[PDB]
Structures are given as structure tokens and as C-alpha cells.
Amino acid sequence: LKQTENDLKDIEARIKEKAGVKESDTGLAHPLQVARCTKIIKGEDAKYVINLKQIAKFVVGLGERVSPTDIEEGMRVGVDRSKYNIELPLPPRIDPSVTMMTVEEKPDVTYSDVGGCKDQIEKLREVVELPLLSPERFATLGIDPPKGILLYGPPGTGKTLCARAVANRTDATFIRVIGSELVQKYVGEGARMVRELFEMARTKKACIIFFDEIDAVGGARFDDGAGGDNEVQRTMLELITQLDGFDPRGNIKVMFATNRPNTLDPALLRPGRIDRKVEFSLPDLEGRANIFRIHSKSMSVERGIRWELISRLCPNSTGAELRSVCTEAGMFAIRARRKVATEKDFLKAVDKVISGYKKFSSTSRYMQYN
């Protein structure tokens, strides 16, 4: 019965909370959709009363002086509709309106494919981590860190796994927005509503947002669409507007995801909204030898096993495809009931998984340029 006795001190403090309400007691009783108050009784020009709603739409040309002495009446005055700025009396302005935002904390992902990502992750570190360490080298040399970056390749073979792993070491705000749900219906639901997230990115610093599912946003057109994809294409152009006139690159990052690099609008892929591109392909053999180690760090393996002959059975592959070999190898200890992971389990798994199980249904010829 904690909540039972918690209200004992809270109801007594509710009057203390009401003491702040005692400033304005009129009209009965900071994120806002549109700025709305009741009559704004408090308030050249002295008092300032503006409201936008179905009744009594107000507008004032002047401002920037103290009528209200900070908050007044309905407490909501500030940025809405754009066009409207009350700044001088401690504004609750540029605040997220009613919308759908996905905000999580600590997207913890460990290392997946280090085989070809040795110097490839360093390019990702030069995006976010670089301005957070030695910003003085940017003003002296005259160079700026990359903002936009593109991810292309097979669907999450250790490419996407690396994208979520580096973001965990950034220690900043992580927000995931996709492109599939972005369509919706109303014009502006996929652009103006997301523009509020882009406008807040300049307000709240230390924010990192990964743009997802760009195939549902961009893409090349010939007949200029069959209809219904115009807003899909206008959202592509709305992303350009935030990068068009002005934008800081310090606290704002741009990263895409797709299966092929050039499937977007060839004008969209033009540089300046993408400074660098992530080239993701099948790395060499000895480079992926650390992948077999990472999965075996927490895995009990018989001492004396030789990984040299195991890697020979496996041709060029990715990080996730190597875990599938150990995944079925873990199933070899289920049915056949092996104590630990042996060499015969790994040598057979490559022929069991890649040769035996995998067979068809893989991405091979589906990426050239386009």
C-alpha cells in the first residue's frame, strides 16, 4: 500500500502545486500542437494575445516586450503553425506536437563482422565520434566531418549489425524512423510531421537518427509515377530542404539503409547529402578469421581444434553466414548430444549449411549498379 500513503504528502503538496496555479486562476486549468489559451486575460503594443483555433484567430505584428511576466493563462504560447514566435517571456516553443516518435535507450549491439570492417568502421567513427573528440582540427585545417552516408548490401548479413553496434558507442540520443510506414495518406504526414523531428534535431543536441527503408522513399522514375507516390517522392525532396538552406553537421547525422546503392533517384544520390558511402561486400578469408573467434569466445570448444582447415571449406561469405555454421553446429550438440564443439561438427556444418542447407535463395546477381 505505497500509493495509499504517498497521496498523504502529495495532497498536502497539491496545494503547494496549486500555489503555482494561484498565479492565474482564470479559465479553470512544453509540448503543444498549436498555441492555445483561454482569452489570455494577462496578455506600439503592450499586451500580447494571440490564439489559433476554430474560434477567434488572432495575429499581432509587433512583440518582443514584457507584458505577461513569463507564463500566462493556458501556459501554451510559442512555436506552432510556424510563422509564430513568442520568445522574450521564457517560451515553451519549438516543442514536439502530437505525433508518433520511436525513442529507445542503449541499443546495445556487440561486434559482428570485423573482417572487411577494419578501416570501414573507422569511416563510421569519423562521422559521429570524430567531432566529439578533437573539433579544433576542423577549424584549423578547414575540413568538416561527413554527415550523410549510405548503406547498401544484402539484408543484414553483418552490415546492419555493424550499424547498430557503432551507434551504441556514440553515447547520444538514438531515434529510429523507417520509410515503409512513412507513406500513410495525408500530405505532410510523411514530410511536415517528420520535419518537426528535423526541426527538433537543431533544438535538442546530441541526437542521432538513422533513416531506414529508403526504398519506400526514394527511387528512380521514368513516367514520373503512376500516382500515389508523389508524396513518397516529395518526402525525398523534403529531406533536401533541411539540408538546402542551412543546417549544422555537428549534432545531426544522416544514414540510409537499402539493398542496392543506385536504386534511388540519381539526383538524390548526388553528393552533399551523402559525403561518404559504405561499400559492403564479401571480404577476404583471413580477415573473417576473427569472426570464428568472436563466436567462440563465449562458446566452449575442444582444445586442439584447427580453424585453418575449417575456413577452407567456407568460400567468401559474410559475418552472419558464418554464425549460421555455428548455429547448426550448436544443433549438432542437441540431437547427436556433443559435450563441446568439435572439429568434425564444424567441418560437416559447412557442407551441411552452405552446401547442404543453403542451396538456392541467396543474393548474388542482384547488385551491380543500376
Next chain:
Amino acid sequence: FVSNSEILKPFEKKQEEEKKQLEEIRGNPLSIGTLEEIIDDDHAIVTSPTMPDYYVSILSFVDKELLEPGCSVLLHHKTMSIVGVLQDDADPMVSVMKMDKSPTESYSDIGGLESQIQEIKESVELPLTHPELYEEMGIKPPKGVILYGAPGTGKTLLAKAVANQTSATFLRIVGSELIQKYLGDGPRLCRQIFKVAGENAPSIVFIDEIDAIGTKRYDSNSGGEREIQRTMLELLNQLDGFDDRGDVKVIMATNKIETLDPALIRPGRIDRKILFENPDLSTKKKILGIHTSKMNLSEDVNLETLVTTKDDLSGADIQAMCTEAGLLALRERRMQVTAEDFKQAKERVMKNKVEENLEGLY
């Protein structure tokens, strides 16, 4: 009760007085609004079809966990400040979702398929009630399973028996209605299903016969119809982009998933391959013999007579041959079926759904 004398004495004195303080902040409209966002200064946002305008500040009785962005709450009578919170139950307003029931299922009619029956049990039923072996080994078990072939022949009926063997919450989501002519309805409803149900660990979602999604060809995004390719893009976020702890499980049983498969499955999130297999002499006896456990028929007729020479009759084909021959014998009100109804029911089933490609020799 014992404490009703001693401990209750310095209790009810403050229990009734706080209720009067509630009547001061409640009244009896109890207006039900919607809380859009939580403010560290204890202030809320009112929502109502009358378009309310309020600066109301968050009162007591609610906490940061109870207050939710967009779920209904209780309001003050005059000032309309937040008081309580609405309790969610019954059926949400999202797309079709089953809640719970206990089916009666086991391995009986699909007997003889045990070669592929014990395979799916290892990656589904075993990593549920015994959450172990991943601490010592360290390899993450697969998420769902993928089955391609003829459904209802005992391959999909296998999934119906596994649902009861889990002894936990089972979910069934429809994968048809996503193909609606409207653009953008696919990725929306699919995300809200797994997000709201993430509280309950067991899910095991089953989907049947998706022939639409999966158009890719040479590029990732083509100029084809947008009613199809973008709907699939949501499934990439569930199986790859955003991964759970192993609660949500997606199962899709269709005819041919070949072209469909490597836009979704990924290397190692879901590893399963199960195809329809022609039963041998031993499997056909266990399928047909167990169906007759409760069935009664003429003792002068052997059940293995038609098993020797027959063309591709699975458990689905036998389900009709038992019903078709049963309705003919039931017309005379007899629990036993004669021999003439056995061959008569096999012809009309073989002459309709069963057709080969007329490919001989080879």
C-alpha cells in the same frame, strides 16, 4: 482479521479522510481524456472531441510508468486536471488479434512424418519451457520457422499440433488482408502487433499462403506496384532491423516461397526448410491406420490393401475419403462403412486435386 484491531486503528482514520480529498479532485464527471506527453514539471495535454483547451498540471495518484503517451486517463471535474488512468483490457482497436484458448492437439494423424516432426520441435518447443543451454554454449537459437509446400497435408497440421504442445500463449495473424488496394496500410498494422504483444513472451505467429509480396528482380526497389513491395519492407525491420529477445516468432507456410525467401529469411535469424514429401509404405500406414482408431468399418476389409498401389494421397486426401465414405454409410444409419465406398471416395479425390505433369521415364 487480526490487524483489524491494532494496526487498522492508525489506518482507517487516514483512509476515509483521503477519500474525501479524492472527492475534491474527482467529483463525478470523471472526464476521460488522452495524455500525449509527460512533462517533468507535471503538466499534461488534454484531448477530447470537444477540442478542449487546458493548461492542466499533473496531479498525484499517477506515476511516470502508469502515464502513457496516448492512453486514456481520468480528469478533474472543474479544472480538468489529470487524476486517474484508464485500464486497458479485452480487444484493442488494432487489427485482428486472437487472445487465448486451449486447443486439444497432439501427434496422431500426422504419424509417420516423425522424421520432420522432431526437427521443428528442436528449434521451437524445446527453447521455450527450458530457457537454458544458451548460457553454456552461447549460440542464439533461431527465431521462427519457414515451411514451403502443400499446406493441410500434415505439414501445416504439424504446426497446429505444436501450438498446443507449447502450453503457453499462441498468436495467429492474418497475412491476406495486407494486400488491400490502399497504399501504406501494410507496414502500419504489422508493427503495432509485435509492439503491444511484446509483454507476453510466447507468441509463435503463423501466416498462411502469401503469394503477393516479394517482388525484387534485378534491383532492390523497382518501378512496379507499390501495394506489394513496400508491405514486405516492414518484415525486414522485425527480423533484422529491430530484433527482440526471442519472444516474437514468425511462421509462414505457403506453396512456393523460393522467389519469396531471400528478401526476408536472412542468414541465421530463421533456419528451417520443410517440403512436402511423398510418403513411403511405412508412412502411409501410420497416417491411415491412426485415422481409423475411432473409426469403425467392415472387419473383412484391410486398410493396407489400397496402400500398396496409390498415387500421392496425404492426410488431407484421407480426411475427405473418410468423410465422403462416412456420409454414404450414415445415410443408412450405420457406424460401419462398406468396401464400395472406399474405392468410390478415392477416385473423386484423385480425379480432381491430384494431377501430374504427365512426365514419364526421365
Next chain:
Amino acid sequence: HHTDCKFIRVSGAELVQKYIGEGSRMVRELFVMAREHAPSIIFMDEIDSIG
């Protein structure tokens, strides 16, 4: 008539819905109506043949 039950008619073309699909929920909504009255026969209309 002779089966001692009811008759439920369901519009096929009206079941198809754009925007947020209603027909997806209309499946389980009619299932509740099918649960309320056990002696009934659900019929699929507008996909049938009147000619």
C-alpha cells in the same frame, strides 16, 4: 429453414476496405456475432452469382 438455425449474409465488396482496413477487423467482429448465436449460417455475398 430445415436445419433449425439462422442465416447470416456478408457483403463481399463492402468487406474490402481502404485506409486502415476495417474488413480485417470485420472478420473478428462477425466472429463475435457468430459466437453470440451458435445456430446460424454465414454466407458470402457480392462474390456470388445472381446471373
Next chain:
Amino acid sequence: FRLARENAPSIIFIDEVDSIATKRFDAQTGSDREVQRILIELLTQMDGFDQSTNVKVIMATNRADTLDPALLRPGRLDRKIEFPSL
């Protein structure tokens, strides 16, 4: 439709009913519901019909293929008059 019950020699003609054809939802109550509450009342005010049988309701339309098929049920709309050229 109340005057149709009072004065018997009355003819009510509604031109261009094709303004609504199949259906729409979108905003729900906003800019939609107006004709959806009519359909319920088209099943209501026409229920009091057949008492006098003096009521005359004739609806004009262009494309009849996308209209409501449920209206063709007897008691609301019985027989449609085709207007070809020929």
C-alpha cells in the same frame, strides 16, 4: 420526407445521387459521416413508407455501377429505369 405523409399528391425528386458512389472513411466524422448517417436514415424514413404509398422518391444518377448494391433490396429501391441512347 415528413411532408410526403401529410400531402398525398407530392413528388420528391433528388437529382444527381452519384455524388456519393462507393464509400469513404478517411477523417471519419470529418467531411464523411454526413452521408453515412443518411444511409441509416434511408433505412429509417423509408421504413415508415408503404403506409400511405403516396410518397414519390426518384433519384437521378450517372454511373450506376459503383453505387450501393444494398439499395436494390426490395423495400427501398425496387426497379431501376435504364437510360441508354439506342
